[PDB]
Amino acid sequence: QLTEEQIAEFKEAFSLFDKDGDGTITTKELGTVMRSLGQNPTEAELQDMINEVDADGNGTIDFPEFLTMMARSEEEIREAFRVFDKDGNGYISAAELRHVMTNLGEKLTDEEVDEMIREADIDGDGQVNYEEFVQMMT
């Protein structure tokens, strides 16, 4: 299920999306995030993404809506894996993850990053391969 440490972690994850700290994620904020991860959703796509997680229909995502979403195919996971595996070599390194997190406006110690890698890593080689990435999601 769901620990207070995880709720804490999802609460800081939400802050990566909620750029202005006003407590909601707007279509504009989501667009910014998505472009920082190399994507280019239209205005209507961003509204679609918002409206799917927007439980109360108010046009923005609050933390309870975000947390709910987080409580919970081939191509989407592969597509996401390629966002992190910047050099295409099949392995997410700590430095590739560092880079992704810095693009999202998040300066992390080399230790924090290594724990993220460590938690996803299954075989212990210090990197995240595609099969390990698939498992993390599921």
Partner: peptide, 22 residues
């Protein structure tokens, strides 16, 4: 950190791809 951040970014990416048009 751990999987929650990693998963959060990953799940939003999934959203992108599951929601595209033409």
């Amino acid at each position: 950190k751990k999987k929650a951040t990693f998963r959060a970014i990953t799940s939003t990416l999934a959203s992108s791809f599951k929601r595209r048009r033409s």
